[PDB]
Design a protein around this nucleic acid. Structure first.
Lengths: 70, 180, 29, 615
RNA sequence: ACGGGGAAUCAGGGUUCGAUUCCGGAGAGGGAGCCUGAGAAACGGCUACCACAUCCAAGGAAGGCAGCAGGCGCGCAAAUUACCCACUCCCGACCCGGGGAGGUAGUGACGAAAAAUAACAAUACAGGACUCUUUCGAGGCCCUGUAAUUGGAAUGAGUCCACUUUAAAUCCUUUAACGAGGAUCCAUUGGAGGGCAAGUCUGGUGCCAGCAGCCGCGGUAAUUCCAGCUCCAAUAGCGUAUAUUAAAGUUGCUGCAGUUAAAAAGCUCGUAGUUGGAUCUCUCUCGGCCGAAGCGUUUACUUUGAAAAAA
């Protein structure tokens, strides 16, 4: 649920084991998926993907460079 | 308001197609032949040639008795003779279009240190320039892509403070003399 | 043999790879 | 939107909407009326002695309220006209940190110039992040004590070695009080992180504890606890929980004069018997041998991460006797299950809800949307409690403070709490499904024996017999009811009473209706395969129990569904139809399921941990 | 949507951006009215009202950061409450005082320029090439390395006296002294099916987890997932998201299409618009023959001139 206008959004948590860095009510920077507001092939009606959770990067958590802050 | 100049300019263009064999091959042959570091040193000398071809290709539409073609076209050939890329008998404006990348890469200070015999390889010239062993007429030059002009080719030497020409030995020889 | 592996596997999942390998054999350097 | 002026107006309303809602909670803290600006200060690196820095920030007017060991004082500098309050603690000590950094408004970290933190400060840093961090600010002490060149590197050789804990923050150094004068302004104008737990309950901090016993032979009496009220309007007919010594009911509140006003005895409430709720948790009406355990716990754990529940089938006792109690589910998520078929006798000792969310929104509204006749916040109210033992008194003279906070209705009885944990990767030791662990569930402290479970949305939940390092698990235990949300910590004594932090997380819904299910997998082997039939050796041994477990569906390790068709051996063999053709590599196995209930090993007493060091 | 000078891209034509340091406009929370003065409807002036909001002893008093810093809020999104009038200039009675104009530092991978992370030599190879031997095999003749083989010679990065720089400092430039052998003083970011450079190698998983812009991959031999090795591309930089430009002759003036792929109005009349067939070969009143003054029906076109801010 977006901060700046209240709108709601389903975003895709990309790599494997990357839902396991997220809990509920967390603050998430979301990007586009790459097709400029259209869905990306396999996923139906999903136009966004998670970039950062809890002000740390997902590529930093997946590759183990950093720790999930609580 | 500030007293600063923001006038800058990029000195290279990247190709339109990134993964193209025999572009990759030809530039790797030009990297290995002339001791260059990365592709961007070929794309830089491709860019100054493309500026010289383009300005001559503009000057070839004006007629032979144009003012601008006679002035600015004689000043284009003068620089290309001066840096030693063209010769003197080929100063029509149509032997500009027969120039290549290798003519411009033979005039760097690196290949000239190799050509004069002050080095023994094209990678030995890069270090001998970069370690500050090479001077041009009085002045230590620290840059390998220093395009050597035609009059400054006869004065390239070994930098009177260096262990190679001057004589005071380096860091290593003096410590081994201390351990003697 | 790129000829046989192309003539067999031009229809399968490995078609693009065997066409790549066959052009590599034919063109050559 | 429509036409440039009803768009500029439409922005102005929503700008005014947001800009006024951010102000309705700013006056919760540190006004001129002044519930004092509590600032907890801890050093991370043990090179940093804490009396080095606190003397420098002492002087506006200093009021040294004396404590046991640490100097926990209050500050007034009226050139900016604010009332600060400074408490101080030590790294690694779980006792003196976690009890007053929970009611604090601000934490002030003191980092060393050289490194970021030692190993022991990283321990209490991990518990504070999971407890719920208030407003925090970095600080350093020895920057200008380095040479005039070697200080512009030392902030720069530090501030990237902090970001794997602290992603972005400036570092306010401490060398002077003119350096600290820029700290108290930065301390004053922050963004106030609102701890979501404390803004529904009325809490307090101990400034001076006084005691006189009713009788001396029974070693229990009545306390005169004094301190500011800092929560909501403190009702008199609510209960009172000291964070380390259980729950009880007080008998008298009274507001004396404020000993520390910003700019320089009446009894008002008494407890009746008609409104005061009764205190009962239940319904009244009805070395190398452990190393031998340790080496197998590096192995019996590892029989779970490669085999799900591969047990051995019983060769001696019959299969309708050893696995009598279980059952087979046709589909683990879409099966019917009566949630009250076999209630244990412990479930006749717990309390139920008609609808937990709708009774939460009615008890959430009354503290905020309804005004009660209790004492309002910001006051200085001392307090007479009824019956607390003498042991809480002299430990305050050692130096630890005692924190008491009010409770909501239905927060003193017993129910079945479900709580989400994630295993902290700082510990590497395995934990059984029914161990004894130290729980810190939202200002409480107790030992318990949980049931680890999986975190799904369906009604059934499969028991995980151990603790994994990546899946988020749910603990389930009998405990007193704490209304959500509540931050959870889990500890375990490794040796010498050192508490090893193993799991963090938050709270799910407290209810007994969560079905946690213990599985058992019966593995067999097919040894004569046919065209869509199979002869399965070793799964059973008798002939008769094959007709017992005939309706229980079968599965294989390669995804094939099947079922028992007939038996053919007088020994334990059977015929089983299948859907695909079985492979020679397969291992057909069936699943048996039953309900499971946790143990009642609740105790409100926790041993006080030692200073946590390394080994 | 502040406008221009301009900026990005670009064969030629074009398209899009231009809040932003120069010129011009406007405005100091929102409207309104004035005083003074050569000049203001002035806000680092005043008087009201509407909106916020500070002190108060409750009678009163004072406000306006879209100046420089700094704070909160907002948000994907942006630096120090630093030093100085020495420079460039401005104001004043003034060679003297003042200037958050401006300069100097700090933060700063916005972006642009140069550019290290090794060079060389002697051995040996079941390495290649050049002369001979039919061939075995004969050589400092030229090259190469999965030699963590040996060997000194060269050097910065750092550490650091001094000078120099500057208002005073820093930085760079110049020099002492120390400063390299796994020269551990280790280079990263994406990838290896095709588009598109580069492995149907090995282990794991088994339409799961996941990958994949697109096509597709994964159901027990996965060229594609998770990894190990190896290889590739750019390289102190490289991925991702979004805006935009080319690719797009997929907006078409150059330069598209309209039977069947999307598309010609049911037919005809008709005003505006747009477009329209041949044809036609410089002189009068004056000044010293050379200048005035007039033209001829009026224009479009083309060529020259002069005027077009600097950057």
């Amino acid at each position: 649920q977006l901060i700046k206008n209240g709108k709601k959004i389903t975003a895709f948590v990309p790599n494997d084991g990357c839902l396991n860095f997220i809990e509920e009510n967390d603050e998430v920077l979301v990007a586009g998926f790459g097709r400029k507001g259209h869905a990306v092939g396999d996923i139906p009606g999903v136009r966004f993907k998670v970039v950062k959770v809890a002000n740390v990067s997902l590529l930093a958590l997946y590759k183990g460079k950093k720790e999930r802050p609580r | 308001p500030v007293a600063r100049s923001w006038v800058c300019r990029k000195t290279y263009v990247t190709p339109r197609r990134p993964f193209e064999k025999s572009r990759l091959d030809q530039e790797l042959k030009l990297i290995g032949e002339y001791g260059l570091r990365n592709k961007r040193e070929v794309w830089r000398v491709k860019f100054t040639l493309a500026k010289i071809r383009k300005a001559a290709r503009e000057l070839l539409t004006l007629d032979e008795k144009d003012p601008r073609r006679l002035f600015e076209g004689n000043a284009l050939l003068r620089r290309l003779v001066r840096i030693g890329v063209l010769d003197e008998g080929k100063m029509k404006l149509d032997y500009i279009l027969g120039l290549k990348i290798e003519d411009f890469l033979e005039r760097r200070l690196q290949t000239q240190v190799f050509k004069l015999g002050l080095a023994k390889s094209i990678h030995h010239a890069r270090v001998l320039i970069r370690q500050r062993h090479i001077r041009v007429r009085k002045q230590v030059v620290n840059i390998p892509s220093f395009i050597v002009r035609l009059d400054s080719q006869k004065h390239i030497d070994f930098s009177l403070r260096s262990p190679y020409g001057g004589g005071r030995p380096g860091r290593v020889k003096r410590k081994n003399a201390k351990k003697g | 043999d790129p000829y046989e592996d192309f003539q067999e596997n031009w229809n399968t999942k490995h078609s693009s790879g065997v066409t790549r390998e066959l052009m590599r054999e034919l063109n050559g350097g | 939107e429509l036409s440039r002026v009803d768009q500029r107006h439409r922005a102005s309303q929503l700008r005014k909407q947001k800009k006024e809602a951010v102000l309705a909670e700013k006056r919760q803290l540190g006004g001129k009326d002044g519930p004092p600006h509590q600032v907890l200060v801890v050093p991370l690196h043990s090179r940093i002695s804490l009396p080095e820095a606190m003397q420098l920030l002492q002087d506006g007017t200093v009021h040294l309220n004396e404590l046991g060991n640490t100097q926990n004082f209050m500050l007034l500098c009226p050139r900016l006209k604010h009332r600060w309050f400074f408490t101080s603690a030590r790294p690694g000590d779980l006792h003196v940190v976690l009890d007053m950094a929970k009611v604090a408004d601000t934490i002030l970290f003191l980092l060393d110039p050289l490194e970021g933190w030692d190993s022991t400060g990283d321990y209490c840093l991990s518990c504070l992040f999971a407890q719920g961090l208030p407003t925090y600010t970095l600080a350093v002490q020895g920057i200008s004590g380095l040479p005039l060149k070697k200080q512009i590197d030392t902030r720069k050789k530090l501030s990237k070695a902090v970001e794997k804990r602290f992603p972005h923050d400036k570092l306010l150094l401490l060398d002077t009080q003119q350096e600290a004068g820029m700290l108290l302004r930065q301390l004053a104008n922050q963004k106030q992180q609102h701890l979501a737990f404390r803004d529904r309950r009325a809490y307090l901090f101990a400034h001076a504890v006084d005691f006189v016993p009713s009788e001396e032979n029974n070693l229990v009496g009545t306390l005169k606890i004094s301190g500011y009220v800092r929560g909501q309007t403190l009702n008199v007919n609510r209960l009172l929980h000291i964070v380390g010594y259980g729950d009880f009911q007080m008998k008298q509140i009274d507001a004396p004069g404020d000993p520390f006003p910003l700019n320089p005895k009446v009894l008002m409430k008494a407890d009746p018997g008609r409104q005061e709720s009764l205190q009962a948790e239940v319904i009244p009406d009805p070395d190398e041998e452990a190393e031998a355990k340790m080496l197998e716990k590096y192995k019996q754990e590892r029989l779970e991460e490669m085999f799900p529940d591969e047990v051995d089938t019983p060769r001696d006792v019959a299969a309708r006797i050893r696995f009598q109690k279980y059952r087979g589910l046709k589909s683990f998520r879409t099966s019917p299950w009566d949630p009250k078929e076999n209630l244990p006798q412990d479930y006749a000792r717990i309390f139920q809800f008609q609808n937990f969310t709708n009774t939460r929104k009615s008890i959430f509204k009354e503290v905020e949307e309804k005004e009660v006749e209790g004492a309002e916040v910001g006051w200085y109210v001392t307090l007479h409690v009824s019956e607390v033992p003498v042991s809480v008194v002299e430990c305050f003279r050692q130096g630890t403070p005692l924190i008491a906070f009010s409770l909501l209705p239905h927060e003193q009885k017993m129910s079945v709490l479900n709580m989400v944990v994630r295993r902290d990767p700082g510990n590497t030791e395995p934990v059984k499904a029914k161990e004894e662990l130290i729980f810190h569930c939202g200002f409480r402290r107790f030992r318990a024996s949980p049931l680890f479970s999986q975190h799904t949305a369906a009604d059934k939940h499969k028991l995980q017999r151990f603790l994994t390092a990546d899946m988020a698990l749910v603990a389930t235990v009998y405990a007193p009811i704490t209304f959500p949300p509540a931050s959870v910590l889990l500890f375990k004594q490794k040796s010498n009473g050192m508490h090893s932090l193993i799991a963090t997380g938050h709270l799910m819904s407290v209810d007994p209706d969560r079905m946690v299910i213990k599985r058992v997998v019966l593995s067999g082997h097919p040894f004569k395969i046919f065209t869509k039939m199979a002869v399965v050796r070793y799964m059973f041994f008798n002939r008769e129990d094959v007709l017992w477990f005939k309706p229980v569906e079968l599965r294989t390790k390669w995804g094939r569904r099947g079922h028992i068709k007939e038996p053919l051996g007088t020994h334990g063999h059977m015929k089983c139809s299948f859907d695909g053709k079985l492979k020679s590599q397969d291992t057909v196995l069936m699943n048996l399921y039953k309900r499971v209930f946790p143990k009642w090993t609740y105790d409100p007493y926790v041993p006080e941990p030692v200073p946590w060091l390394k080994s």
